[PDB]
Amino acid sequence: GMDYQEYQQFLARINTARDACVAKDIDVDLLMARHDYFGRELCKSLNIEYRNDVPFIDIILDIRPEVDPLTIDAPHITPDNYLYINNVLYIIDYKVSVSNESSVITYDKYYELTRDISDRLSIPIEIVIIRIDPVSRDLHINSDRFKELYPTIVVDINFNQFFDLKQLLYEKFGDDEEFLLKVAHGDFTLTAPWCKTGCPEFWKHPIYKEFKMSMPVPERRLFEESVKFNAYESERWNTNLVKIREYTKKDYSEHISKSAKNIFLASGFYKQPNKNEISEGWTLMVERVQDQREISKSLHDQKPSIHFIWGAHNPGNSNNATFKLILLSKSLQSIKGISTYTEAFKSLGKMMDIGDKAIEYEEFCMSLKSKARSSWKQIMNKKLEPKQINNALVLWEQQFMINNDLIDKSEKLKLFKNFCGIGKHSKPKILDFDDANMYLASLTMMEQSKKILSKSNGLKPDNFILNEFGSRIKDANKETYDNMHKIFETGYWQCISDFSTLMKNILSVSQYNRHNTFRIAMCANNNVFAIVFPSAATVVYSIIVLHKEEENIFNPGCLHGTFKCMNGYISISRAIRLDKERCQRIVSSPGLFLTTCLLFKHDNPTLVMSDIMNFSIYTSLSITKSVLSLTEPARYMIMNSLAISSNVKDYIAEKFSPYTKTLFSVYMTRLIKNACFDAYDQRQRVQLRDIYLSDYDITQKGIKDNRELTSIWFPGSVTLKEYLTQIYLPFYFNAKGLHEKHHVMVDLAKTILEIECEQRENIKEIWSTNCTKQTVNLKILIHSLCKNLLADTSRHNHLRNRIENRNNFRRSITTISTFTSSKSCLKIGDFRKEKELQSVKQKKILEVQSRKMRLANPMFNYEMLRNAMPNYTDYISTKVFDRLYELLDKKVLTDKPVIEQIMDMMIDHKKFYFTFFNKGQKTSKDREIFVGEYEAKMCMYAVERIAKERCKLNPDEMISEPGDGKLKVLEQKSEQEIRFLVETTRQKNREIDEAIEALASNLGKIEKLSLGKAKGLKMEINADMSKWSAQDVFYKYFWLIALDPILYPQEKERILYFMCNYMDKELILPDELLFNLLDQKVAYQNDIIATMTNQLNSNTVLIKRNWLQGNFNYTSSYVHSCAMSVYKEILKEAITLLDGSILVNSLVHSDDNQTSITIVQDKMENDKIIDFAMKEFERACLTFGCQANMKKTYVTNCIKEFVSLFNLYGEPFSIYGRFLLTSVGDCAYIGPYEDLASRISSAQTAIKHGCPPSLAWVSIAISHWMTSLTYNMLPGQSNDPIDYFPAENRKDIPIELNGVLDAPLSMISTVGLESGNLYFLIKLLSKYTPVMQKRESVVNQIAEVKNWKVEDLTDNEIFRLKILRYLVLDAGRSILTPRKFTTAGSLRKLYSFSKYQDRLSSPGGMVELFTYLLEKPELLVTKGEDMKDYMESVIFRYNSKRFKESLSIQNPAQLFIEQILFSHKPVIDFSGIRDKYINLGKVTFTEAYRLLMRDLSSLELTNDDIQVIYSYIILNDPMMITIANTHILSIYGSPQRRMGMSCSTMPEFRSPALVLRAYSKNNPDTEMARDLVHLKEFVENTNLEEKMKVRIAMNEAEKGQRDIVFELKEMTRFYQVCYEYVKSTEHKIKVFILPAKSYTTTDFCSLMQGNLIKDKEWYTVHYLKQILSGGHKAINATSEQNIAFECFKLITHFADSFIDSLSRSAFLQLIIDEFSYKDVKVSKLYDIIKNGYNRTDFIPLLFRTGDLRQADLDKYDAMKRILIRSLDYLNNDIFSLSRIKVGLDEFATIKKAHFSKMVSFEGPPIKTGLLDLTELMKSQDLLNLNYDNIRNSNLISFSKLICCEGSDNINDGLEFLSDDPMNFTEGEAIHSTPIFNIYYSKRGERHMTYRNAIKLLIERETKIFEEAFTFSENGFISPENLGCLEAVVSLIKLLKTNEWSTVIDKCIHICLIKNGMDHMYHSFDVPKCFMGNPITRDINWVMFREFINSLPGTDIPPWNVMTENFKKKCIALINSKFETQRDFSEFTKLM
RNA sequence: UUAGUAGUACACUACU
Ligand SMILES: [Zn+2]
């Protein structure tokens, strides 16, 4: 990026400097260094000459020197650069800054002065100031004339390297306040106050009394003093803040020492995990569980592991519906024996008989299905009636009627009372997992499963996934394709998939399942069936299977019993009562399952594939809560047990509680138990990779991947990365929303009331010194607040200004999202009236639904609560957008500034109320959400937001960093430590290491000195705080508001009052919880809920110290940061004692914490400091009121846990798996494209977090599978659109119609779904383009499109383009989307929806809205900027029936079934499809394909229509421009192993609602005026201004009068398509893990491309031309130049690196003339360099050719006193093209380029004795700049570099190679606790030249070739063998020159030239033996043939296989020559 | 709103 020379000198100046005024100048010099750097590279980007601080009076003299500068008055300014074209002078003053505030100042200053001579000379002078952003990198130019000149400018600039120097300078001097004084943009500017008057009540409040009670009396007054302090009044802002700092400095200075001095007190005794410590924990766990749960040893109490019973399919019987129905009927009737429900199952088969009348079932059912398939809506009013067939009364296809005559009254009861459990109505029941005869039973269940499921399907291993994605999986990694087959083949896959396909059909049936009906559900298996019994939503089902022989059935613990029938055996499973939410997951279980297996097995050959799948079905299908209780606690139980410092005992003895209800759970528990002990013995089995560090980051970082560790869930060995996956991944198998709300509300309530009681009874004291639970070290707090509050205001002065802007404090409440959102909200008051009326309605609807059930199968309160509970404070649920509307209409909210309204609300609202609703997430331990009043939301907003922008300043806080941005931060901080550790070790041990190499004589004396030295120590505290919210003093936060400098006194009074009320805040127990406790039935022994509510009197309990979970994150997080800031100071004083160095780095995120400590020792042992660090860690937490959970907290020597994002020893790594398990049931079930959109987004996310392409593609397959399974769009399904459309396969069917996503992953990762459309257009620009222009930019290939011929194209090719233009372009672009008939639902709670009723009811008032909205069309798309505007927007919104539904929650489970059932019904309205073709009702999916073709065939494809596609898609979006370029200019290079992974940021490829108001009326309300100009162009170029008006203007003559509906609906479309153009998208933080650091776009592109090709090897990427094009106005000049630079940089270095010094000019001269780099002649590139204005870059090149003149030297010398003859003399002994002396010791620079580019050279061969330097250029292996790599290289690699034309003495011929020394890589151990070797590049000695390397290679490798090709006991001598050699090398020329043969020839050649036998080799033709007659050149193939067989061969590596293949090839080939398949008639003609 | 009466409608259908 930047120059290396200036970096080194600026780094040294930071250490050299001591005083702040010296450090000041280093910051000033760094600005100019960046200033010129931007200018140097931009001048080449614009092709102009570079200049610096050139006077304006001289700039005119270049244009017109006839008038002298004295008489003509020119403005005396100092511009940077100038240009004169088109009779206009353009003045340049480039500058790099974040804001244009510094640019407009210099703009108007220049514009004013330049006008003095602008009218004097009558030549207009334009000011062109170019500014670039130093982080986001965006170009900003003010000149409009300059915009039209340069359409696109190349800006791949690097500031990343500049900020590295800034970090160093603001580290040493950043602590000193003398340096902070010098950096200022106003010193300190405090903005306008948010309030006018203070708060008197705050000083009176009893909580403020209680605050000062505990506090000491000097502190009491200080708090008074601090609040009343105004920062704007006193001379400086830090008057008070420093004053209170200096008071507490007595106790602080002492307490910092106190903690630090404990380093000597410590011992080598810390909570370390050990086999016994784990064992002890388990035993106390057993005791706990055996009390807390009812332990059972009986095998009848178990629950099903899986809720399914699979049995082998029967191919002998027919696979057809009607047949199976009767088959199961007779089968069920035929059941023989006696049980409980035997005669019940018997009659059920009897009630589904058809027999003779099989054909009547085929018709009757098809009529009913056809009746429903006609209508969009369901068939209402008409009564469904059954038809008597044999004994059964069929109601629908596979639906029957329960006939009360066919079953006994007693036998009907048995089935429903006992078996189905309809009418059945104290510890939990669990299985003893410590019983070996229970663990046995559990193991035998697995042994049983493996015995049956391992057996193959025997059916074709070809399903949609493999059929359509197999190709794209296989090419990524062939292993995974096979792995997939291995699964699909095995009964495992058929078992799950048939349960999936069966459940889909169980749900589909269960929807219309009545109370007098039992339904039958069949699957792809013709033995497996299911019976769905009447449900009293709840699905009641049994799996009924007809397995072959007895016990050829899989029972996981689900089966009721097997039964013998009259033909075979039939088994019926226990009645399962599951919920649709659970069942859904079972349907998507195969996708979950495949991923599980593939992820585990991936690239690990030691694992048993049949054992992975054996475990996987029991996970992917496990829907019980038994499993979650294992999967979650395991993650910590393993990691704790393999960490260094960690408390396992306590975690296993308290936090671990198995709920082993099922039988898999028992087996899985013991898998975990065992895995805990294996960890302890593997702690030291972890190794640390050899770190190849050579300045600016490291490649080959992180942990060593060694397969020495042991797996957890199955047998085999595993890698660390894989071990971690096996540890953490299990938890993501867990299922969401399993927690029954009835139980959650109780346990959530109980906990809050338990911890509040704790505080009420036990915790009384607030502050303390000894450090105790819920206590803060008040003196230490106040100081550490003061110190940080200073540094978080000194580093940014406008801090109060930044808060106002970024959080919209000044603007009206109606603008901020958090307030105008559709989130849940709590309303307080009295609703006893409507709450009673809303309840009794449902209590009647209860009886309504019961009355109807009494007729068919006779099986069978809010008033009470209010009457019973006296002190019941009444509340209600509402919406956040609705509350705002309510508070405005009743006028308490206004257009007053939101903060100004907040301040008043803090003092107005005095009592705060909060309610909780459960999340019920995948975790077994349930999480609560506290949601209270809207009034509260406003208060917390300010307090939290003020802390937000404060927290952002501190780099330690990470809640500030949105998205997965933390991952890179982990890395950047880990790398800083790995570097520091090395740097510091080399700085101390250098004195000792010198003596070691000196003596190494006797080695017995060396060990004495090698012991007594410095010792490295790294450690990471992977923390997790205990009860961050509940067990935390809220009183401490009062001080943060008090001490605050950027808060006014009248604000400070008001903030603290609200917080004073947030102590007397009440928790409302929601009614649903109170209803559970309403019906007593004997109360709880010790009822905590009743205790706190006084035997249930009030529904409110007061919560004090427990500030509610998530309400004060940032606030608490700043105090956390302040706490860890102390921990730093503690250790940093402790390590100065021992005399060494320490680097502590703390990452803070509310409750999740990570703190990395790196120490270089001298005195005491490493293990002492380990215990010391942990002591002060808890101390640091507890001195601030927070307590650290030592249970979950673990410490490693590498690993970093932080928010579950993991960084290893530099190498960042997340659990790629967790995101692949999302693409299964994560969608809103809207449409085929709409579903896939989010399912592929989940796959895109995996790639970010370092996922292999092979597995990435799997998710893409699964996603498609589920997507197509939802709407019956799979191959062979109903809506299968391959026959309906013209196409070969689903790759060619548009993804809008649902097909497959045919694109490269490197595109899908970037854009996705749209990629599939983009690839179909790039395919064309690689088919329908000529030989010229195709190799050039994409832009050029788009110009040729309008010169194509339409007739050339094919049916499919035409088909895409027609939809792509007439449909896709304008309409998340979908065409097919099913519409529903859903109802609005109950919207009574809403106030705002009532005001729509009143405006709809009263006549005229409706139209009045729409007529008002037409004069303000800004309020159709965006919400109002003012009260009325926002309010009336809310009412209009209700117009949409979709927005009315949006505020109601539909179950995705129910939504899923509704898209299956409504697929054969008319759902897609064609009206909205045909409208576009023209500019009936709903249409069925099948008909939608037909009716699309009837319209499509009519449309016309032109040479223009196609050119609109290539404009609107490619040429419009600068991103799509580059993506297409990257895939056309792509040149994939060297395949390499993924050694070093690094984090990389996604690059850039680039007023809202107020602008649209200035479009409605052209007058705005200055910068916003300029924004409308480009908006005018957008609407005029597309011409959508007229197109919209014409569409309305001709509709009023179509309809008749004035339709207000069309007046708006068409006007809204016009404003919504504006929104996307006007309101710009925020470039959110996206981090991709790549094989190296991506600085700029091009770098990112190359590394991204190469990461998503193969799994085993990543590839480095090249490009012919620049890929970064900006549009279709910008059509090469800037793409050419850089090629010339690359070329000559490459050549000069290749020449001075490898070619002999003596003959380097000749080489260059030969290369320049007859050669070409990247299809451009090197001469033309040289001419481009010579005609350029940066010749100073290529001084040594120009001198060597004789194209260097004095002007260049004079310029070069002026950039950073010379003569030509001086150079001519000086460089008489320096022979290099990359370097010439331009002084006494100053050499010239050529700037080295990478050597992976030399392949892009194409010229005639240059032969040098024997070597062909062209082939050395074209070589891959022999281009490394490492001596050892080339010395220890293969002869196969070198054998390409030989021609020799009969040379001699190989030693002589190698004279044309560099006899200059090469660079070797040396490595050394670092002497850390995690001991690793650093490897770096040295310069070797002298005898390490390129020649000697080649020679040593030749010698070593030829010796091995000789002994392999002896074929006798002689050698490479003895003509008896030379004859054999001649024979073997003869055939090689008379056969076929493939690739294997030629190598042998050239190797033999080499070997014979070496031995001095190259005076005959060239005169070696076929011997006399083989040649019958010498003259008559006849060949005896038979002889030759038998000669090849008669060759013995050798088995020495590496030639053993080489020779073997050669022989076979040559034999086969020879035999081929003979074998000529002649025509049968041919010979019959000749003779 | 309130009450009474009569109703409430459909997927897989496979190499198995
Ligand atoms: Zn030769």
Residue numbers in the entry: 0 to 424, 438 to 548, 555 to 878, 892 to 1031, 1037 to 1407, 1423 to 1530, 1544 to 1614, 1622 to 1636, ...
Relevant lines from the article:
To reveal the structure of the C-terminal region of LACV-L and the overall architecture of the complete polymerase, we determined the structure of full length LACV-L (LACV-L FL) by X-ray crystallography and high-resolution cryo-EM. Transcription is initiated by a “cap-snatching” mechanism, whereby host 5′ capped RNAs are bound by the L cap-binding domain (CBD), cleaved by the L endonuclease domain several nucleotides downstream, and then used to prime synthesis of mRNA2,5,6. The previously unobserved C-terminal region (1752–2263) protrudes away from the core and forms an elongated arc-shaped structure that includes the mid domain (residues 1752–1841 and 1978–2025), the CBD (residues 1842–1977), and the ZBD (residues 2026–2263). We also capture snapshots of LACV polymerase in both pre-initiation and elongation-mimicking states, thereby revealing, amongst other conformational changes, the movement of the priming loop that unblocks the active site cavity and permits accommodation of a 10-base-pair template-product duplex, characteristic of elongation.
There was clear extra density showing repositioning of the endonuclease and for the previously missing C-terminal region, but the resolution was insufficient for building an accurate model. In the crystal structure, α-helix 91 protrudes away to bind to a hydrophobic pocket present in the ZBD of the second polymerase of the asymmetric unit, forming a domain-swap dimer.
